[PDB]
């Protein structure tokens, strides 16, 4: 119930509108997203309602909102390294298997938690996985997330970002939490190659082919271990009923043996 600029000292812009700020009472660094109150709020409202219901170390926290002048200030957990796709672009380097194993282990714990709560993220991609400066990965951008309920055991909205969308999401048939596991497999290729399969095709053409085409594979299979190859194959099983869960993939040899967040220390330092 206090004015936002007496609670927060706003520092630099982080994105275009998102700012770094200090919570003046604890010295904790936060991210503040500022949107005009007169803008289209549909996805911000959806996003904030999903984040408010989540309490996981693997999901970006929401701390609250304020009116300031004619803007809405949305206060969130600060992830100082930015997104995985920011880190790939900034270093001009794809991630090693070990870096990918460590990031995807934390991503999978975030998926396991969301899936237990009957949430589907629906936009899993390197752009939507943020790292804090200590190297802990967090799921962000709940703008298109779905909620299963007792009476609605499936969603059927064709939604997501085309290159990352599961075949059953593109097709008319309903789907459930394991749509995110397909998106995770595409994200694994994205982190290893810098872009998803079909990145150079028109998105609306790519969406037409994903349901009919075989599961994608690495562009240069000889670069990658049997474990990494098998991990991607399990993620990209076309049958949703047969596809591995987040819990099961946490035991996959590629993930189960991942190094701690220290292997991301070089990576984060170079990026920042
Ligand atoms: C030219 O290409 C682009 C350049 N890169 C670039 O803009 N990266 C970048 C990456 C970010 F993650 C980013 O946002 C954050 C940064 C730190 N900590 C955060 N905590 C929460 C967020 C965040 C930002 C936006 N959201 C909404 C989905 C509600 N949430 C956040 C941002 F503002 C910018
Ligand atoms: N990222 C900074 C610092 C570093 O590389 O350690 C430059 O470049």
Author numbering: 23 to 38, 43 to 298
Study text:
MAP4K1 activity is enhanced by prostaglandin E2 (PGE2) and transforming growth factor beta (TGFβ), immune modulators commonly present in the tumor microenvironment. Therefore, its pharmacological inhibition is an attractive immuno-oncology concept for inducing therapeutic T-cell responses in cancer patients. Through its proline-rich domain, MAP4K1 binds to a diversity of adaptors in hematopoietic cells, including those involved in T-cell receptor (TCR), B-cell receptor, and cytokine-induced signaling. The function of MAP4K1 has been studied most extensively in the context of T-cell activation.
Protein X-ray crystallography confirmed that the urea moiety interacts in a bidentate hydrogen bond with the Asp101 side chain in MAP4K1 (Asp112 in the surrogate kinase MST1).
